[PDB]
Design a protein that fits this description.
- By secondary structure, the chain is α/β, with parallel strands linked by helices.
- It has one domain.
- It is built from 6 helices and 9 strands.
- The longest helix has 17 residues.
- It is globular, with a radius of gyration of 16 Å.
- One of its GO terms (cellular component) is extracellular region.
- Its main location: secreted.
- This is Leaf-branch compost cutinase.
């Protein structure tokens, strides 16, 4: 019996909409915290259970509202999710990594009463869009205690990350900001072969695909977090032997399937 298991037996359909958990929001002002620019916490309410934590970084010149739908989506399926604002909208990927670190420390140590009540501080993960995706890869390299990392259409000038943290990268086929050939695909291939890794490439998708309700991003982000943060093997079925018409490529070393 898995003590971290949450919600009913999943259907793919159920992972394309908000999950069974009611979502509370807490606005963290940038002057209320050090090491990052505050943001919005999406967390389960109407429940006495504890859940894993996710720090999520938006991309260059973007704010927390650019990943609001996904923070809510993940929270609704049973996670405490802090979508950060950066100290500056112009902060680079390695700056975003440091702020994700401060955000994770904040959630564990100085988050509001209702948030701490729902958080299992032992089970933490990271995700991010673009330069935020770059930051996600960097913090994974720095913090091997993290359960999972989901870089969404990630951007970074460095291509090789020495992380053991399970990584699922979402590439957008027609990305002109972070071209998959220069960013996402190199990141995937340059990850250690012993690191549980998945690459999904969205058919004819743009760089901003992760900034609005996206069925595929929903399915793969929820499933990866569920499998690694909660040890919930009910979500293997969505990450193993995948034939998804929304994907124009799917790659994995298949370490997560048994």
């Amino acid at each position: 019996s898995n003590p971290y298991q949450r919600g009913p037996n999943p259907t793919r359909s159920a992972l394309t909409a908000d999950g069974p958990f009611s979502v509370a929001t807490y606005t963290v002002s940038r002057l209320s915290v050090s090491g990052f620019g505050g943001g919005v916490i999406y967390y389960p309410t109407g429940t006495s259970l504890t859940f894993g934590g996710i720090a999520m970084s938006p991309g260059y010149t973007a704010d927390a509202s650019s990943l609001a739908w996904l923070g809510r989506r993940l929270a609704s399926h049973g996670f405490v999710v802090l979508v950060i604002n950066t100290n500056s909208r112009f902060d680079g990927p390695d700056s975003r990594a440091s702020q994700l670190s401060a955000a994770l420390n904040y959630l564990r140590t100085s988050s509001p009463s209702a948030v701490r009540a729902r958080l299992d501080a032992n089970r933490l993960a990271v995700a991010g869009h673009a330069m935020g995706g770059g930051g996600t890869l960097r913090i994974a390299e720095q913090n091997p205690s993290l359960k999972a990392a989901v870089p969404l259409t990630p951007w970074h000038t460095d291509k090789t990350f020495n992380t053991s943290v399970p990584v699922l990268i979402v590439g957008a086929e027609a990305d002109t900001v972070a071209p998959v050939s220069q960013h996402a695909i190199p990141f995937y291939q340059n990850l250690p072969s012993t690191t549980p890794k998945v690459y999904v490439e969205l058919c004819n998708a743009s760089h901003i695909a992760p900034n609005s309700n996206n069925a595929a991003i929903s399915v793969y982000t929820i499933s990866w977090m569920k499998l690694w943060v909660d040890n919930d093997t009910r979500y293997r079925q969505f990450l193993c032997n995948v034939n998804d018409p929304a994907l124009c490529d799917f790659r994995t070393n298949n370490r997560h399937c048994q």
